[PDB]
Design an enzyme around this catalytic site. Structure first.
Site, PDB file in Angstrom:
ATOM      1  N   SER A 243       5.263  33.014  39.212  1.00  0.00           N
ATOM      2  CA  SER A 243       6.496  32.778  38.043  1.00  0.00           C
ATOM      3  C   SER A 243       6.736  33.823  37.159  1.00  0.00           C
ATOM      4  O   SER A 243       7.176  34.590  37.347  1.00  0.00           O
ATOM      5  CB  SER A 243       6.177  31.283  37.584  1.00  0.00           C
ATOM      6  OG  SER A 243       7.299  30.752  37.218  1.00  0.00           O
TER       7      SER A 243
ATOM      8  N   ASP B 266      13.440  33.634  35.313  1.00  0.00           N
ATOM      9  CA  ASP B 266      12.199  34.282  35.647  1.00  0.00           C
ATOM     10  C   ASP B 266      11.878  34.973  37.164  1.00  0.00           C
ATOM     11  O   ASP B 266      12.879  34.988  37.818  1.00  0.00           O
ATOM     12  CB  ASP B 266      11.172  32.936  35.329  1.00  0.00           C
ATOM     13  CG  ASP B 266      11.193  31.859  36.447  1.00  0.00           C
ATOM     14  OD1 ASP B 266      11.978  31.993  37.315  1.00  0.00           O
ATOM     15  OD2 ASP B 266      10.184  31.134  36.541  1.00  0.00           O
TER      16      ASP B 266
ATOM     17  N   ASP C  90      10.624  34.519  39.920  1.00  0.00           N
ATOM     18  CA  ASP C  90      11.014  33.647  41.217  1.00  0.00           C
ATOM     19  C   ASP C  90      12.054  32.841  41.053  1.00  0.00           C
ATOM     20  O   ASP C  90      12.473  31.787  41.960  1.00  0.00           O
ATOM     21  CB  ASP C  90       9.807  32.812  41.613  1.00  0.00           C
ATOM     22  CG  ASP C  90       9.452  31.606  40.623  1.00  0.00           C
ATOM     23  OD1 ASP C  90       8.810  30.486  41.093  1.00  0.00           O
ATOM     24  OD2 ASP C  90       9.701  31.888  39.446  1.00  0.00           O
TER      25      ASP C  90
ATOM     26  N   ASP D 168      13.221  30.142  39.770  1.00  0.00           N
ATOM     27  CA  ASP D 168      13.441  28.954  39.758  1.00  0.00           C
ATOM     28  C   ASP D 168      13.914  28.344  38.313  1.00  0.00           C
ATOM     29  O   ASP D 168      14.342  27.144  38.149  1.00  0.00           O
ATOM     30  CB  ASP D 168      12.248  28.116  40.253  1.00  0.00           C
ATOM     31  CG  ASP D 168      11.200  28.121  39.478  1.00  0.00           C
ATOM     32  OD1 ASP D 168      10.845  28.960  38.550  1.00  0.00           O
ATOM     33  OD2 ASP D 168       9.889  27.863  39.906  1.00  0.00           O
TER      34      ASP D 168
HETATM   35 CA   LIG Z   1       9.541  30.131  37.898  1.00  0.00          CA
END
Ligand SMILES: [Ca+2]
Ligand SMILES: O=P(O)(O)C[C@H]1O[C@H](CO)[C@@H](O)[C@H](O)[C@H]1O
Length: 448
Positions: free
Chosen positions: A97, A237, A239, A241
């Site tokens: 993350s 961020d 990744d 999400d």
């Molecule tokens: Ca994330």
């Protein structure tokens, strides 16, 4: 002891001490024993170790007779979407993350991208891995390479009416994470002009960790927006999400206000839907959902809880103040891409800036933002706060830590399930001075 990488919602550790290839492979073998039947979708993020961890995880899976579907470099939501889309038995995203350079981890889902938590099989995997002393078997199943994102892309575009979109100017800050690849695949199908900051995927993160809450990453996006007169800016961020917004003045918009705004955008398309929200910050979300004809549904924060409440209530949309946005049509999963498409449509259709869409909400319900504390005794700290305020008779709620409603102001105080922190959120009914006083006063009780 027990393995430290296995947190509540996922696997997070330092490579190669808490997480490494042999652990990853063992996780693969253990996961094969937890899933119903079907193949397993694998994806990874830009981090330097993530391909080797995926290869190890694939080997363990194929040694135990599971076919692997490798979708390659991707964001976390693509593993969710592809797991549901391909009716796989589950999926695993290799990612850490927003965390430091020497970290990696994994997020795990079963069928229909349902989360695997410590509650629901992740600790059974941990226990299996802890005991697995066996030698790695050889691959008895195949790996299919499925890097085509067409279905994912087509899905994302289906949320907006492309003929209502204006040629807005948007700053996008991928933080050298993976988001710019999705942006560049959507761009030919959109009329927007993009201003790309920190765009290329780079696991050395030369411009720093992709974490838009850090002021240097914040200032990079805010500056791009003002310099280029963009309509608004978007940062993710690593990744992607999580999605964070910046208005045309360069001002960062607290994720809290996007929940109510995205709610209204959605209930314009699906009237009378249920909307799931967390308990940290509530008043603005509830009133906007209700004004739009929806039903607000309170849920304990944390992505595994939100997704389950949404399934069980058939909620059209859910939102946390921590920049996670969840969509029923997206397998009840979170996406960092759908939010900004919805906002772009809103601005295009209303003729209102993002700043003006939220302005009155921020004045109506000012909030402190999330404030974190490392204290000596979290219990004794919480005790002091409750003591100090008991003589005012607040309405209490323990859905998620402690929420105390005093009429004109409220707060939520709760321990984190992923760090040993206390997290504080305060908000008032249109009173910024009361907000500041109460936030300082509570901060003092906490530390003292
Ligand atoms: Ca994330
Ligand atoms: O550390 P916490 O507060 O328990 C959990 C934190 O990470 C989760 C997963 O990214 C988010 O769903 C949650 O809203 C956030 O506060």
């Amino acid at each position: 002891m027990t393995l430290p990488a296995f947190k509540a919602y996922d696997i997070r550790g330092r490579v190669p001490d808490e997480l490494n290839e042999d652990l990853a492979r063992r996780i693969g073998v253990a996961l094969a024993a937890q899933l119903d039947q079907g193949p397993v979708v694998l994806g990874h993020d830009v981090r330097l170790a993530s391909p080797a961890l995926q290869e190890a995880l694939s080997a363990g899976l194929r040694a135990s007779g599971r076919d692997v579907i490798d979708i390659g470099l991707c964001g976390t939501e693509e593993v969710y979407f592809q797991t549901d889309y391909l009716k796989a038995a589950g999926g695993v995203m290799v990612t850490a993350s927003h965390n430091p350079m020497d970290y990696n981890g994994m997020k795990l889902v079963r069928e229909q991208a349902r989360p695997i938590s410590s509650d629901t099989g992740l600790f059974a995997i941990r226990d299996t891995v802890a005991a697995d002393t066996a030698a790695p078997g050889e691959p008895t199943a195949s790996e299919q390479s499925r890097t085509d994102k067409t279905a994912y892309l087509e899905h994302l575009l289906s949320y907006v009416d492309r003929s209502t979109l204006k040629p807005l100017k948007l700053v996008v800050n991928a933080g050298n994470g993976g988001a710019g690849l999705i942006v560049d695949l959507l761009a030919p199908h959109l009329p927007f002009e993009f201003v790309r900051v920190f765009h290329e995927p780079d696991g050395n993160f030369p411009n720093g960790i992709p974490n838009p809450l850090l002021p240097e990453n914040r200032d990079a996006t805010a500056k791009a927006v003002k310099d280029n007169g963009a309509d608004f800016g978007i940062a993710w961020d690593g990744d992607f999400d999580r999605c964070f917004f910046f208005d045309h003045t360069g001002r960062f918009i607290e994720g809290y206000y996007l929940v109510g705004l995205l709610a209204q955008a959605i209930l314009a398309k699906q009237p009378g839907g249920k909307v799931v929200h967390d308990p940290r910050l509530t008043w603005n979300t509830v009133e906007q959902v209700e004004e739009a004809g929806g039903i607000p549904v309170l849920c304990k924060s944390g992505h595994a809880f939100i997704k389950e409440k949404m399934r069980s209530e058939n909620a059209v949309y859910g939102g946390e103040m921590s920049a996670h946005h969840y969509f029923r049509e997206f397998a009840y999963a979170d996406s960092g891409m759908i939010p900004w498409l919805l906002i772009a449509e809103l601005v295009s259709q209303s003729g209102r800036s993002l700043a003006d869409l939220v302005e009155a909400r921020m004045q109506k319900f000012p909030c402190s933002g999330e404030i974190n504390f490392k204290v000596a005794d979290a219990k004794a700290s919480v005790a002091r706060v409750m003591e100090h305020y008991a003589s005012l008779s607040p309405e209490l709620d323990y859905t998620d830590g402690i929420s105390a409603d005093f009429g004109q102001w409220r707060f939520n105080l709760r321990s984190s399930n992923t760090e040993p922190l206390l997290r504080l959120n305060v908000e008032t009914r249109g009173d910024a001075a009361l907000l500041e006083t109460r936030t300082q006063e509570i901060s003092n009780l906490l530390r003292g």
